[PDB]
RNA sequence: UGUAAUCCCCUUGGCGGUU
C-alpha cells in the first residue's frame, strides 16, 4: 500500500517521500494469422487472413484485391481441420 | 530609459498584418491552454475563431512592444490599436 | 490504394437517409431536396417532367462532384401548391408513362414476332 | 497476348471470332471483307480484331515448367 | 475510432510528454482524456496546410490552402492557381507541409492564404 | 400518349422508334439499359491448378467477362441481401472448368463451352454460358500444350454495370433524333457549303426535309427518337428494353415511397 | 590468373574504365545496365554513343 | 519435407535441408519450389 | 492543363491494364571457418531483434511458397546469422538467443502474389534464392499516358 | 492459463522525372 512520490518542489531526499495509497487521490488471440472466410456483408465468400485482433473488430487482408479491411467477429468463418467453423474457434 | 512615453509615440496607430497574425496566434494558443475568455461565446468552439471574436471587440489583453532600430521601444495596447 | 469501393455508388448506408428535404427560406414556397446514391438518370427525368407543370415556377438540379454519387434539387411552386405534392405528382406521372410505354412495346413486339 | 473477350469501347464480344477471322483470311478474303462477314460494323470493334497481335503462340513454344 | 477509421487519431500525449500509441493499445476505449492533453488526430477538412512546388522562384510558389479529403491518390487544385505555381497536370508533383501548432496555423491562415 | 414503333427485331438487337416522349425520358431509358439492368456474371474464381502460360488473375479477368444466360435473374437475390452463411443456391451459381492437353504434340484450345454448371437455383434458367448455336465453341479462354492443365471453380453472382462493366447486358445503344436539324440543336462546321460536306443520317428518309422557304420554328421540341439496342446474348433485346423500363419504374416508386414515408 | 579476370570484371561491372586503385581520374559510365523496359528501349540503348 | 521441381527436366522431388541443391536425376543446379496447397481466390475483376 | 478523361468501362474491360513483376535476391554469406548464415524460419525464442512483420507465411526451409498472397513488411526470406551466446545458459532452459535475424521483408508500399521461387547455389557453393512477386496495375487517376 | 514481436549502413556511380 506504499507509494513512492517524487516532486521537484520538495528538496528533502531529492523530492522523494513515501505516502500510503489510501491517502491520495488521482489528479492470446488464437485466430491471428489464420485463414478466414466472410459470410455476411459486402464481401461474402472472400478468403482472407486475420492481421489485427484487438477486439470485436478484426483486420482481415483480402486475397482477391490488394487491400485490408476491418470486419466484426460475427462476420467471420475461421478455417479448421474439418471445414469451416463460425466464431467459436 | 529605453521605454518611450505614451505622449511621444510616433509609430503607426494601426495594427499591422504581422502584429494581427501574431496576436491571433498567441491568443488562440492561450485559449487552447484554458485561459479565461473575455467575450461571450454563442456557439463557437474553435480557439482561433474565439480569438478573432475577441479582437473584433477590442478585448484581447495583450500588449505589442514595437522595437525601434536603436533599441528603444513603444508599448501599444491591443485595445488602442486600430484594426481593419 | 485510395480507390473507393464500386458498390458505394448505389448501396445506401444505414445511417444515411435516401432523401433529405430542407426548406429554402430566401424565396417563398421553395424546398431543397438532397438525393443520395443517385445521378443524372433520375435527376434529369424528374427535372424535365416537373418543368412542364404550370404550378412549378422553378426546378433545377446539380451534381456537386462526379466522384460522389448524389445530387441536390431545388423546387419552387406557386402559392396554392406545396412542392412535395408536385414532386409526388411528377413521380406518378412518369410511372404511368413508363407503364403505357411498356404495354405498347409488348404489343408491337408480339405483332412483329 | 490473346484476343480480348470484349471490345474495349462498346463491349461487343469479339473473343469468339478470332478463329473464324483466321479461317476467312486463309481462304483469300481481304481483311475488310473478313471483318464485314463477321458482322463487325463499328470501327471500334474492327480495330480490336484488326490490330491484335497473338503473342501466346510465342509463349507456348517454351517447354512447360512442370510435368 | 482509432488510427484506421476516418476521422481518427494516432497518438494521445499526456502532460508529462509520454506518448500513447493507439495501434498497440488493447484498451483504447478505456482511455479518459484530461484537459491539457494532446490528441494527434487525423488531418480533417478546412485544416490550413502549406502547399509548394519546386523550383520556388517567388513567394507565390508557397501558399496555404484548406484541406478537403477526397478519394484516389492525387492532390487536386483549382485550375486558377496553376499559374502562380507554374504547374500543369502532365506529371508534376507538389509538396504539402502541415503546421503543428495554433500559432503556426494562425500564421498560415492569416498571411500565406 | 407515348408510342413505340419497331423497325427491325432480332434476338440480339431491336431497332425501334419512340415518339411523344420527352428527350429526358428516352435518355434515362438508354442510361438505365446501359448500366442498371441486373445480369449474372462470374465474380469469384478459385484456382485449384493453373499451369498455363497465362497469369491466374489474367484468366480470372477473362472469365469475369464471359456472358452468362441471365433470363431468370429477377428471382435470384443479391449476395449481400442473402442471410445464408457463405453462398447458397439462391444467391450464386457455381460453374466448374477443367481442361488438359493429352499427348506430346499439338495445342489445345480452352473454350467457354467447357464451363459446366454444377449448382444453382432450382429450375431457374440462369448460369449457362451464352452460345450462339449448338455447335458454337464460344469465347476462347486459354491455350494449352502438353502437361499443362487448368482446373478452376467459378461462382457467378447478380449485379449491375455500375459496379463493373462485366454485368452490362448491352454493348452499344445507338441513339439519334432530328436527322434534318430542324431544331437547330447543332451548328454544322464547314469549309465551303455545310449541306454537301456532311453525310446524311441513316434515318433522313423518315422525316420530310425542311422547305426552302420555311421559317425557323421556335415552338418545336424533339419528338421522335431512333434507338438501336444491341445485347451480348445474356438477355434478349426485348427483355433488355422491358427490364430497363421496369428498373426505372422501381426507382421512381422507391423515391415516391421515401417521400410518402418522410412525413 | 586473377589479375586480368578481376580487372576486366571490375571495369565491366562498375563502368570505371581503368585499374581498380585508380578509380579517380578514370573515364566513368562506359559500361551501363542494359535497359529492358521495352524492346525499342533495348535497341536504342545498344546503339548509343 | 517440401517439394521442389527441377529447372530442366521438371522432375519433382524433396529435400531435407541438408542435401546439396541439385536435381537427383539430371544434376541441374537450379530448382524451383512447388505451389502452395492453400486456397487461391480471385475477384474476377 | 494536359489532363485527360478515361472511360471507366473500357478500363473494366482491360484497357491499358498491365502486369508487374519484382524479384528479390538473397544468399548465405560465409564469415569464417564455421560461421555461416542459414535459411530458416526464425523463432521468437532462439533469435533476437526480429522484424515487426509476420513470419507465418514462411515454409520449413525459410522460403515462402509460390501462390501465397503477400502484403507490405511481410517476411518472404527467413535468414539468421549466428551470434556468440551470452551468460543466459545460467538458468535458461535452452531458450537463449544464439542467432540474430537477417530476414528480407517485402517492400512496405508493395503487395502481390508470390509468383516463382528459385533456389540454387552461388559460385562459392552456398545457398542462393530469388523470389519473384507478381501484381496487376489497373489505370487510375494520376497515371501517365502519352501519344 | 500459456501468452507473441519492434529494427537498419555508408560511400559511390549510373539512369531517369518536373521545371
Ligand atoms: Mg509539366
Ligand atoms: Zn466495339
Ligand atoms: Zn444465399
Ligand atoms: Zn532435373
Tab-separated table of C-alpha atoms in Angstrom, chain F residues 10 33 43 49-50 52 56 65 120 124 147-149 163 167 187-188 190 198 210 234 248 257 260:
chain	number	residue	atom	x	y	z
F	10	UNK	CA	-33.899	-9.891	-83.650
F	33	UNK	CA	-30.387	-0.135	-70.173
F	43	UNK	CA	-17.436	-12.846	-59.660
F	49	UNK	CA	-4.467	-25.624	-60.532
F	50	UNK	CA	-3.185	-23.372	-63.309
F	52	UNK	CA	-0.799	-22.457	-68.307
F	56	UNK	CA	-4.017	-16.530	-62.634
F	65	UNK	CA	-16.129	-11.022	-68.928
F	120	UNK	CA	-27.639	-23.135	-58.994
F	124	UNK	CA	-34.243	-21.232	-62.940
F	147	UNK	CA	1.373	-31.375	-69.449
F	148	UNK	CA	-0.370	-28.026	-68.884
F	149	UNK	CA	-3.661	-28.177	-67.007
F	163	UNK	CA	-20.299	-1.854	-60.122
F	167	UNK	CA	-22.580	-7.045	-65.766
F	187	UNK	CA	-24.306	24.067	-85.738
F	188	UNK	CA	-22.507	22.491	-88.667
F	190	UNK	CA	-17.962	23.610	-92.867
F	198	UNK	CA	-21.961	16.402	-94.155
F	210	UNK	CA	-37.429	21.404	-94.473
F	234	UNK	CA	-27.150	-12.820	-71.893
F	248	UNK	CA	-36.814	2.873	-63.966
F	257	UNK	CA	-42.312	5.699	-51.080
F	260	UNK	CA	-44.652	9.442	-48.523
